[PDB]
């Protein structure tokens, strides 16, 4: 059972299909409509079932053309309110019925951000976007909000006719709304079964540009040109991914570049990956995020975690595939550079949380934990480290890629646990069971901290970054004149970021050093978000007041949690900026994404 859901479990019943008809009302910040669930019993004599909801208003439930009884339970904090529905006839095993729920969302839906015109690029039209992962689909529509259940869906969405709707589905046309001449209906079909967390909706003044044979990029007009160039490697990456995972089953692979408040780097919504506009570096250098989202089309979207306790299955295997895509494009030594950088990020996470912190375990027990509070890079990097260790133990990357492809084929269209995965690993590698039995499984899967063994990493591309960082760290005042813009001449953007990450791991540095760094390298001019982020953190943690306005601007003019959360934490920890940071958060809170607003507030102990 999934401890994060209040619905009937998949052993009682399973939703097979959703037909969603809804209208997006910007004046009331609500979605209103009907969710028709086709539900298949998995037990004899099924007479009622329970769905997840959060802040939903229910108008009626109709089964076989008649209204039926239902009841909402007491709220269970972030889990929401269970909804019990009484069936009009009892179902046998495998019998199906269609349940049509009439509902309305709350303006405070934790799934949604509603933007006024002034919060958009274009300034003339409002905007809406969803983010359902992990357990926010229940704040859009009543459902079994667990990744253990997979369903196809169709949808018809009425919007103001000047705007465009897109969903995590194949576009299936548009028509005027026959009931309202100010509106247009956009239609969608998702024929591949998905977990409900992959349901997505955006409505705004969106334009599209074709960038490959099965890819459009979508954004407000102002960002289309830049996005189309930034993501032009998309089709090449899809072809690599198909070689590694097997056929891409989803038809279209579109990209939507969201407003700056999108909380994540990307989200793997099927047929319509969502990405942060913080990726628009100008040089394609943050394209690993696109590789990552592409990879989810196999690991996550085809083979899915059964509950959120096993999230590392989704992320670790995706990061493993991502790094192979970027290794195929730019070489194996680049794969190792990225892998090593990930170990660094894991070190950072373990130091921040503490080496005994339960959120440093690979398998977590989220029973009474808001999944959004648990989120971190641990499942990503500890998960990747496990897989990279296994690759190295079991004969190298070609061998382990064989396992990955077999794993995806085995569990396609299924939801699985860590034990499912481990059993399949032992089956696939049964001729190497003696090797597998050297792994300290309990440590790797269930213990906090750094993993018990560190993989081997090629250092070729890292050495220049380490050498320059060590020069700065060991420099005294009288050595500062020795640094020059020529120090950077043979570093890629990726190496510049790694130099800053290496250096930030040793922060603070003396204030004079940081001042000299800006004087010779002019890092303040760099627009790349990753580089800028680490540079500003370095400056704040080294107590440079000149960086306060820069860091406050970055923290509030975008909302990617990876950047915003630590920028706010560093600004709150610097006495010179503490007041301004708390004030700035409180003033921006109403305009923030609800989840990022919640988490910043927790971090700051404010509000």
Ligand X SMILES: Nc1nc(-c2ccc(Cc3ccccc3)cc2)cs1
DSSP string, 2-38: -TT--SPPTTTEEEEEEEEEEEEETTTTEEEEEEEEE
Q: Which stretch binds Yb ion (CB under 5 A): 55-63, 169-177, 275-283, 537-545?
A: 169-177
Q: Catalytic site residue 391?
A: no
Tokens 């269609």 belong to 98
563 vs 568, which CB is nearer to Zn ion? 563
Residue 95, annotated as binding a ligand = no
Query: Which are the contacts of 28, defined by CB distance < 8 A and separation ≥ 6?
Result: 107
Residue 512, annotated as binding a ligand = no
Which of 598, 561, 552 lies closest to 579, judged by CA?
552
Residue 374 binds which one of Yb ion, Zn ion, ligand X, none, with CB within 5 to 8 A depending on kind? Answer: ligand X
Which pairs count as long-range contacts for 466-474, CB under 8 Å and 24+ apart, including other chains? 466/502, 468/499, 469/499, 469/502, 469/503, 469/506, 472/503, 472/509, 472/513, 472/517, 473/503, 473/506, 473/509
Token pair for 171: 């576009």
Residue 265, annotated as binding a ligand = yes
Contact 46, 52 (CB under 8 A): no
Q: Is the dihedral of CA 484, 487, 489, 491 positive or negative?
A: negative
Least Å distance between CB 364 and ligand X? 4
Least Å distance between CB 343 and ligand X? 16
- Write out the binding residues for Yb ion, residues 467-526 only, by CB under 5 A: 476, 478
Tokens 């490697």 belong to 233
Contact 461, 337 (CB under 8 A): yes
Using CB under 5 A as the criterion, what x/- string covers residues 416-455 for binding Yb ion? ---x---x--------------------------------
Which residues, in sequence order, are bridge partners of residue 21?
34, 156
Residue 546 binds which one of Zn ion, ligand X, Yb ion, none, with CB within 5 to 8 A depending on kind? Answer: none
Q: Which of 100, 233, 293, 381 is catalytic?
A: 293
192 vs 364, which CB is nearer to ligand X? 364
41 vs 415, which CB is nearer to Zn ion? 415
Residue 243 binds which one of ligand X, Yb ion, Zn ion, none, with CB within 5 to 8 A depending on kind? Answer: none
What's the Rg (C-alpha) of the chain?
25
Contact 10, 146 (CB under 8 A): yes
CA distance 444 to 450: 9
Residue 77 binding Yb ion, by CB under 5 A: no
Token pair for 359: 């959120």
Residue 311 binds which one of Zn ion, Yb ion, ligand X, none, with CB within 5 to 8 A depending on kind? Answer: ligand X
Residue 125, annotated as binding a ligand = no
Least Å distance between CB 259 and ligand X? 19
- Residue 606 gets the label, from left (phi > 0), alpha (psi -120 to 50) or beta, of beta
Residue 266, annotated as binding a ligand = yes
CA distance 8 to 43: 11
Which residues, in sequence order, are bridge partners of residue 243?
none
Token pair for 46: 């099924």
Residue 264, annotated as binding a ligand = yes
Least Å distance between CB 303 and Yb ion? 17
Least Å distance between CB 43 and Yb ion? 9
Q: Which of 70, 197, 380, 389 is catalytic?
A: 380
Residue 423 binds which one of Zn ion, ligand X, Yb ion, none, with CB within 5 to 8 A depending on kind? Answer: Yb ion
Which strands sit side by side in the sheet containing 70-72, from one edge to the other?
A: 46-53, 81-91, 70-72
311 vs 400, which CB is nearer to ligand X? 311
Residue 148 binds which one of ligand X, Yb ion, Zn ion, none, with CB within 5 to 8 A depending on kind? Answer: none
Q: Is the dihedral of CA 210, 214, 218, 224 positive or negative?
A: negative
Q: Catalytic site residue 380?
A: yes
Give the interface size with Yb ion as a residue count (CB under 5 A). 7
Residue 560, annotated as binding a ligand = yes
Residue 21, annotated as binding a ligand = no
Residues near ligand X (CB under 6 A) are: 133-134, 308, 311-312, 359-362, 364, 371-372, 374-375, 378-379
Tokens 């209204």 belong to 67
Active-site residue set: 293, 380
Which amino acids are annotated as binding site for Zn(2+), given as ranges? 292, 296, 315
Applying CB under 5 A, which residues contact Yb ion? Answer: 44-45, 172, 419, 423, 476, 478
Q: Contact positions toward Zn ion, by CB under 5 A?
A: 315, 318
């Amino acid at each position: 059972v999934d401890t994060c859901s209040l619905a009937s479990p998949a052993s009682v019943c399973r939703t097979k299909h959703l037909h969603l008809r809804c209208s997006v009302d910007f004046t009331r910040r609500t979605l209103t409509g009907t969710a028709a669930l086709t539900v298949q019993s998995q037990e004899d004599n099924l007479r009622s079932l329970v769905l997840d909801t959060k802040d939903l208003t229910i108008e009626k439930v109709v089964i076989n053309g008649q209204e039926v009884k239902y009841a909402l339970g007491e709220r269970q904090s972030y889990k929401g309110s269970p909804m019990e529905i009484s069936l009009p006839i009892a179902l046998s095993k495998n019998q199906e019925i269609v349940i049509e729920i009439s509902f309305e969302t709350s303006p405070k839906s934790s799934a949604l951000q509603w933007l006024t015109p002034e919060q958009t690029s274009g300034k003339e039209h409002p905007y809406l976007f969803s983010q359902c992962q992990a357990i926010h689909c229940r704040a859009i529509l009543p459902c079994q909000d667990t990744p253990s259940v997979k369903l196809t869906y169709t949808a018809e969405v009425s919007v103001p006719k000047e705007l465009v709707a897109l969903m995590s589905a194949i576009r299936d046309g548009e028509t005027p709304d026959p009931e309202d001449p100010s509106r247009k209906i956009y239609k969608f079909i998702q024929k591949v079964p998905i977990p409900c967390y992959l349901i997505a909706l955006v409505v705004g003044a969106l334009e599209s540009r074709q960038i490959g044979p099965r890819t459009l990029v979508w954004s407000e007009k102002e960002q289309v040109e830049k996005s189309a160039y930034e993501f032009s490697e998309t089709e090449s990456m899809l072809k690599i991914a198909e070689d590694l995972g097997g056929p891409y089953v989803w038809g279209q692979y579109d990209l939507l570049v969201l407003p700056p408040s999108f909380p994540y780097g990307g989200m793997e919504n099927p047929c319509l990956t969502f990405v942060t506009p913080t990726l628009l570096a100008g040089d394609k250098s943050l394209s690993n995020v696109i590789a990552h989202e592409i990879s989810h089309s196999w690991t996550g979207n085809l083979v899915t975690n059964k509950t959120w306790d096993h999230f590392w299955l989704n992320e670790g295997h995706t990061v493993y595939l991502e790094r192979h895509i970027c290794g195929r494009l730019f070489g194996e030594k680049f794969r190792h550079f990225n892998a090593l950088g990930g170990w660094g990020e894991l070190q950072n996470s373990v130091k921040t949380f503490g080496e005994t912190h339960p959120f440093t375990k690979l398998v977590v027990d989220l029973t009474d934990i808001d999944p959004d509070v648990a989120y971190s890079s641990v499942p990503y990097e500890k998960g990747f480290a496990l897989l990279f260790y296994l690759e190295q133990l079991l004969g190298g990357p070609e061998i382990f890629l064989g396992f990955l492809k077999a794993y995806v084929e085995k569990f396609s269209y299924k939801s699985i646990t860590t034990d499912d995965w481990k059993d399949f690993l032992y089956s696939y590698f049964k001729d190497k069971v003696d090797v597998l039995n050297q792994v300290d499984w309990n440590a790797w899967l269930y213990s906090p901290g750094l993993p018990p063994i560190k993989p081997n990493y090629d250092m070729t591309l890292t050495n220049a970054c380490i050498a320059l960082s060590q020069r700065w760290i060991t420099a005294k005042e009288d050595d500062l004149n020795s640094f020059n813009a020529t120090d950077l001449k043979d570093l890629s953007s990726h190496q510049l970021n790694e130099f800053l990450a290496q250096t930030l791991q040793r922060a603070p540095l003396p204030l004079g050093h940081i001042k000299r760094m800006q004087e010779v390298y002019n890092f303040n001019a760099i627009n790349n978000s990753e580089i800028r982020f680490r540079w500003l953190r370095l400056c704040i943690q080294s107590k440079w007041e000149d960086a306060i306005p820069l860091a406050l601007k970055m923290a509030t003019e975008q909302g990617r949690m990876k950047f915003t959360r630590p920028l706010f934490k560093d600004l709150a920890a610097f006495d010179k900026s503490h007041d301004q940071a708390v004030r700035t958060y409180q003033e921006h809170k109403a305009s923030m994404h609800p989840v990022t607003a919640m988490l910043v507030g927790k971090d700051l102990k404010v509000d």
